[PDB]
Scaffold this active site. Structure first.
Site, PDB file in Angstrom:
ATOM      1  N   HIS A 168      34.162  51.968  47.474  1.00 11.77           N
ATOM      2  CA  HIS A 168      35.492  52.567  47.525  1.00 11.77           C
ATOM      3  C   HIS A 168      36.478  51.606  48.182  1.00 11.77           C
ATOM      4  CE1 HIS A 168      38.608  55.578  47.731  1.00 11.77           C
ATOM      5  NE2 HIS A 168      37.797  56.511  47.265  1.00 11.77           N
ATOM      6  N   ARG A 435      27.648  39.102  42.795  1.00 16.56           N
ATOM      7  CA  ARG A 435      28.893  38.434  42.435  1.00 16.56           C
ATOM      8  C   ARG A 435      29.289  37.453  43.530  1.00 16.56           C
ATOM      9  NH1 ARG A 435      35.057  40.410  41.343  1.00 16.56           N
ATOM     10  NH2 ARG A 435      34.893  41.104  43.516  1.00 16.56           N
ATOM     11  N   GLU A 545      39.901  35.408  35.628  1.00 16.40           N
ATOM     12  CA  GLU A 545      40.892  36.215  36.335  1.00 16.40           C
ATOM     13  C   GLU A 545      42.324  35.808  35.997  1.00 16.40           C
ATOM     14  OE1 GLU A 545      40.262  37.002  40.441  1.00 16.40           O
ATOM     15  OE2 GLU A 545      38.076  36.751  40.364  1.00 16.40           O
ATOM     16  N   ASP A 582      43.174  41.895  38.363  1.00 16.12           N
ATOM     17  CA  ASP A 582      43.139  40.492  38.770  1.00 16.12           C
ATOM     18  C   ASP A 582      44.151  39.669  37.978  1.00 16.12           C
ATOM     19  OD1 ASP A 582      41.076  40.318  40.870  1.00 16.12           O
ATOM     20  OD2 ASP A 582      39.726  41.073  39.323  1.00 16.12           O
ATOM     21  N   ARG A 620      38.107  46.661  37.311  1.00 16.46           N
ATOM     22  CA  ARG A 620      38.969  47.735  37.771  1.00 16.46           C
ATOM     23  C   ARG A 620      40.405  47.505  37.302  1.00 16.46           C
ATOM     24  NH1 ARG A 620      42.797  46.922  42.002  1.00 16.46           N
ATOM     25  NH2 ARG A 620      43.194  49.182  41.953  1.00 16.46           N
ATOM     26  N   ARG A 752      44.113  39.589  48.111  1.00 20.03           N
ATOM     27  CA  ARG A 752      43.292  40.270  47.125  1.00 20.03           C
ATOM     28  C   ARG A 752      44.127  41.291  46.358  1.00 20.03           C
ATOM     29  NH1 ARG A 752      38.057  38.183  46.893  1.00 20.03           N
ATOM     30  NH2 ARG A 752      37.705  40.182  45.814  1.00 20.03           N
TER      31      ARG A 752
END
Lengths: 943, 266, 139
Positions: A168, A435, A545, A582, A620, A752
């Site tokens: 989460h 990852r 990305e 991303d 995501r 991020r």
């Protein structure tokens, strides 16, 4: 006690019309709200209750008409509260919002679908009220496309839906508070049974109040930012909750749907229609707390949960399997097990076999608890199942036998559900993906080439890297030993590879390279895998990305397929990951979406060239990450042949409750995933007209220009970002397990994407999601009078463009510029005020343009259900917003003194004592955390 | 079809007999119903056939829901046939005239089936009935309105097969089933008890229990106490399985609850 | 023990210290933790077999055919480098497996038990350098 009369009026104004006539959502939320306010009165006094109620009334009136007066009244009341009452108000609005989401869950789950509201086109697939169920998808495939049921049955056989659970981004709420929410939902639902008895109803009401108080009386802070293992169990909660039981019920419904169109077989039990994967304990991109021991931990913990669940299941299977007629094979096997050992008599052979398997299950569970809790065990290999085949063989024997004796109906009961649970869940429930950034692999290779005195792998050009990697993968000589200067990071990477080597492959999915850019990153990971003695190396997955990485990705993938060593290692299968958020952080949202469409197209062309089967892993932020009805059309809207019977989607923690918390919810989730994958496989969306592609290319250029000009070219942008937004506080507080930046001293680049999105989502502004659309649409509208019509054509006929715009419109419905302006007024330097003003103007313009594209005059004109639900949540979110703004003002400015009001009502005996070791004023830290969790929970996902 | 339920019995006591609600509540406080389970004069049916009958009943009942969906109904019919065959395809003889312990477990099936959950539900309904006639208290939890007894493993009248060892068996087996049920219950009790405001008495005891020991944090004291009780439950169950399957144990008695008072106190 | 001896002599109890305590100390120094130290002994030709299998599997020639000085040179360059020499992917005869596994068993034990590695039929420096290299590359 006639406060109930007031809030009822306000609720009926917020949701005026009826989206049907089972629309009991206002009744639900009014009930939960009244019970809650009464409990609040009993616990914290009358005055507090009246204050909170007045606050909500004003917030709802603001959501109604948006007069700034309401905002300033909310502010006036909120500034006057000493931090204790601020805590009580914030907690109050958190719980009220959760209750709103609960009444919504019940409303949606028990809304009966309307057949007569379907239009006949793809639009219907963007809402759960008109989306197709499995059977309607079947009949649409057969009637409209003249597909035979056998083709459907094969398509299902080979189709795979792989759902990946992630941690989460913020509050993965306590498994206990989840439980309490569940009880509240059940109480609501049962309270609304149209036949219930007076005492049943009275005891249900009492239970409801009891549980609303029970939930309110539990903290939501303290302790640690829970360790990766704690987050990982908190992830696997939903396996016990719904998923474990849910898989076989869904599959059985697939059988029924197949029967109802003429197919007499069932879906074979070992067919992998559903698969589950996990990142919890494997993702390391910017997360030092995920150590190799963390991975070994969640691996063995997963195997424990599996063996436990199988064990508790096989008792009921042994009870069910009381037959005595059996196959000769099963008879001989039973004679074997009995000789080598209530005591299971030989006349119940099914019970013999299942009792032996029960033994192996218990021995495996204790062995895994000994491997985790110590580091060794005494249990030899034979008391346990090491692979899934040893497990499957006796069960399949029992099925063969039962069908041999004509007991197939018995075999299609508990035994079939068990077999399917074994095939779906394996020995581990999930498969862990690892990852890591490509730059860490490059660091390791550079240290190796320097220690071998060959140069520095880093300085080498991309092709030279490729050449050295190829010669090294070719040779027979290992590459290094313990005598190697290893930084802490290098040691982390190598030790991670060794931990992978010392574990069963049943737990590992894919090795995902973040910031993947070139074939040398992939070949590098392959080489490290082999030279770290990884027996069965994982499939390597590049994650492209940045925008340029997406432009160059097909060329890199083709070059990879053209290399014989890699071409043979991959064995005709390749998985590539894309990140909507991303790429969005890099080049704006419109450009990232269109670029992703084209990039998937080209990747499919490469896979068809080299005859490799491509799986697209959706990260995501995507459209497929919204959850619900929109996921149906979003999956349908992928470019043709990009799916091909293998879907892989990220299940974000913020949606995992809306997707697997309840029975109906889990079922509808698995259903829409399977139906969307199948239908898209057999019925691709229209291919886009070329004028559309050119138009999207221009708009991509304009949009990226505006986006980067604002986020990167404006110098004072980062000062504004640090002022008008709680980014720093999120980066400092015990909310998420990950640091908010990769490099502390960098700007937005090293920031991020999760805090980038979250930061602007908090302020009801959502700048990263819509920024860029305004200048592009304006540009093309001014370029030609006709382009607008063209755009409106796309929105109505091109699924991809429709799902994109729809997402933007939905985000604008969750936005409010006035609240953003309040944040500016309280937190931003005056010479920076016009900057924000300009941005907000952009905001409004973009909104007006998006509406114009969709043919709408109001936001969400076509989906009044969603409009209602958003309006209802928003009436609670706004107060959390204002409270958050002024709380930030107090935290940052010790020189801003307020006129406090008297305290209300009741080592820790009051709510302010729950944070001893606090840095800021008592109760401000907790209030800010509360508002962040509440706003974040009420807005859910945006971009 | 016409017998009085609890509440109708109350209104008959109050209206017709001029009994005060307080008199009714006292009478309930002191009343005890002691139901004694005996062995079946013939076939004490296999616990498995009980389960299968249960599934058949559930299937019938859900099949006659006035709202059911076509696919739910089809899968329900399939489950019904499936289970009727399942029951028909199992033998009902062979083996031994099952040992007294086997009959005894086959007796205690009904605690798991209905009685364990059923007791507090009924008691809560007695509370509701008391509320509806003006009584604000509940029936005290330690009041023994319901009590269960067994002859299984104890009755010897004309029965050589009930040996003393049979008695020791069914004793320890009973305690095992008890500690099992309590243990499986206290996990969900521990989930419920996530509050943080607590009595000074409870605070001190929690500080003690944590000092003498997810790892049960000290700001969740209820979970401290109930986790301790969970420990004692587990030790008791394992001790009973060791006394039954062997004849001795190493687990000391003090790690377990020996009487009802030690259990009730926390 | 040496602490006890120091103490006894500190209190002028050296005669007591030169009794049972001294005999014990000397028994510890003479006998160590193992009584004895085990020497390993093996023919040079088995080491040559292993190196030949390695050079053939690396496609460099056959260490056996190489002249004594060429052997010396390859052994020197290999002892110089930083790259290990082989892994589990190596065609090992029963004998080669015996040699390598012997070296691993040596690696997994305390040095207190091992004296010398004796090369039977020793003839040339390459036999000695070979055993040294196998020792290092077997960790």
């Amino acid at each position: 006690l006639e406060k109930m009369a007031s809030i009822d009026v306000h609720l009926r104004q917020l949701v005026p019309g009826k989206v049907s006539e089972d629309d009991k959502l206002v009744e639900y939320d009014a009930l939960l709200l009244d019970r809650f306010l009464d409990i609040l009165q009993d616990l914290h006094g009358e005055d507090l209750r009246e204050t909170v109620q007045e606050l909500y009334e004003h917030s709802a009136e603001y959501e109604g008409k948006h007069e700034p007066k309401k905002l300033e009244e909310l502010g006036s009341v909120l500034t006057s509260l000493d931090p204790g009452d601020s805590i009580v108000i914030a907690k109050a609005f958190s719980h009220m919002l959760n209750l709103a989401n609960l009444a919504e869950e019940v409303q949606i789950a028990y809304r009966r679908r309307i057949k007569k509201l379907k239009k006949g086109d793809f639009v219907d697939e963007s809402s759960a009220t008109t989306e197709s169920d499995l059977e309607e998808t079947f009949k649409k495939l057969v009637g409209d496309l003249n597909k035979s049921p056998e083709e459907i049955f094969d398509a299902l056989k080979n189709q795979t839906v792989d759902l990946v659970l992630t941690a989460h981004p913020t509050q993965s709420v306590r498994r206990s508070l989840l439980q309490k929410h569940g009880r509240i939902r059940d109480c609501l639902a049962q309270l609304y049974a149209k036949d219930i008895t007076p005492d049943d109803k009275q005891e249900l009401d009492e239970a409801l109040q009891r549980e609303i108080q029970a939930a309110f009386r539990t903290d939501e802070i303290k302790r640690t930012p829970p360790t990766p293992q704690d987050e990982m169990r908190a992830g696997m909660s939903y396996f016990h909750e719904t998923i474990w039981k849910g898989v076989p019920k869904f599959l059985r419904r697939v059988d029924t749907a197949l029967k109802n169109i003429g197919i007499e077989e069932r879906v074979p039990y070992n067919a992998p229609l559903i698969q589950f994967s996990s990142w919890m304990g494997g993702d390391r991109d910017g997360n030092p707390r995920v150590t190799p021991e963390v991975t070994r931990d969640v691996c063995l913990l997963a195997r424990m949960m599996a063996a436990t669940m199988y064990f508790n299941q096989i008792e009921d299977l042994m009870f069910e399997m009381s037959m005595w007629r059996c196959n000769d094979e099963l008879r001989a096997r039973a004679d074997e097990v009995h000789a080598n050992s209530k005591s299971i008599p030989t006349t119940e052979p099914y019970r013999v076999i299942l009792g032996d398997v029960r033994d192996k299950l218990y021995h495996t569970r204790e062995r895994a608890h000994q491997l985790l809790s110590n580091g060794h065990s005494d249990v030899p290999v034979e008391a346990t199942f090491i692979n899934l085949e040893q497990f499957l063989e006796p069960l399949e024997l029992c099925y063969r036998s039962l069908c041999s004796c004509g007991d197939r109906p018995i075999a299609d009961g508990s035994l079939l559900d068990f077999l399917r649970q074994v095939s779906t869940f394996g020995l581990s429930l999930v498969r862990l993906d690892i990852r890591q950034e490509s730059d860490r692999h490059t660091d390791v290779l550079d240290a190796i080439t320097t220690h071998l005195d060959i140069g520095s792998y880093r300085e080498w050009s991309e092709e030279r890297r490729q050449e050295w990697l190829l010669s090294e993968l070719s040779g027979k000589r290992p590459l290094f030993g313990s005598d190697l200067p290893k930084t802490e990071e290098i040691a982390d990477v190598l030790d991670t590879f060794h931990v992978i080597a010392e574990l069963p492959a049943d737990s590992f999915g894919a090795y995902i390279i973040s910031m993947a850019t070139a074939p040398s990153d992939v070949l590098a990971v392959e080489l490290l895998q082999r030279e770290c003695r990884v027996k069965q190396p994982l499939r390597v997955v590049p994650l492209f990305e940045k925008l340029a990485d997406l432009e160059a990705a097909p060329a890199a993938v083709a070059r990879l397929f053209s290399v014989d060593w890699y071409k043979n290692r991959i064995n005709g299968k390749q998985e590539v990951m894309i990140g909507y958020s991303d790429s969005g952080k890099d080049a704006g949202r419109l450009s990232a979406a269109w670029q992703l469409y084209k990039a998937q197209e080209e990747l499919v062309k490469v896979a068809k060239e080299y005859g490799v089967k491509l799986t697209m892993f959706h990260g995501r932020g995507g459209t497929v990450g919204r959850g619900g009805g929109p996921t149906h059309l979003a999956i349908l809207s992928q470019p043709p042949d990009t799916i091909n019977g293998s879907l892989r989607v990220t299940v974000q923690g913020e949606v995992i409750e809306q997707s697997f918390g309840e029975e109906h919810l889990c079922f509808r989730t698995l259903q829409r995933f399977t139906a969307a994958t199948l239908e898209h496989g057999m019925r691709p969306p229209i291919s886009p007209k070329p004028e559309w592609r050119a138009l999207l290319d221009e708009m991509a250029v304009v949009a990226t220009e505006e986006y980067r000009s604002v986020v990167f070219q404006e110098p004072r942008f980062v000062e504004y970002f640090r002022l008008a937004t709680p980014e720093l506080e999120y980066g400092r507080m015990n909310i998420g397990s990950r640091p908010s930046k990769r490099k502390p001293s960098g700007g937005i680049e090293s920031l991020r994407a999760i805090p980038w999105i979250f930061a602007w989502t908090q302020t009801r502004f959502h700048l990263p999601v819509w920024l860029g659309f305004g200048s592009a649409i304006r540009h093309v509208i001014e370029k030609d009078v006709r382009n607008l019509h063209m755009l409106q054509d796309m929105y109505q006929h091109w699924p991809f463009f429709r799902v994109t715009i729809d997402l933007i419109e939905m985000v604008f419905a969750k936005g409010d510029p006035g609240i953003a302006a309040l944040y500016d007024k309280l937190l931003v330097s005056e010479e920076l005020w016009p900057f924000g003003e300009k941005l907000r103007a952009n905001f409004e313009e973009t909104k007006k343009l998006i509406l114009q594209t969709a043919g709408h005059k109001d936001l969400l004109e076509g989906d009044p259900y969603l409009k209602q639900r958003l309006r209802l949540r928003d009436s609670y979110i706004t107060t959390l917003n204002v409270c958050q703004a002024y709380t930030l003002k107090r935290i940052r400015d010790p020189s801003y003194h307020v006129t406090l009001r008297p305290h209300i009502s009741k080592p820790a005996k009051e709510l302010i004592e729950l944070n001893p070791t606090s840095e800021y004023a008592p109760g401000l830290e907790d209030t800010l955390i509360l508002t962040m969790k509440g706003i974040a929970a009420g807005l859910q996902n945006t971009g």
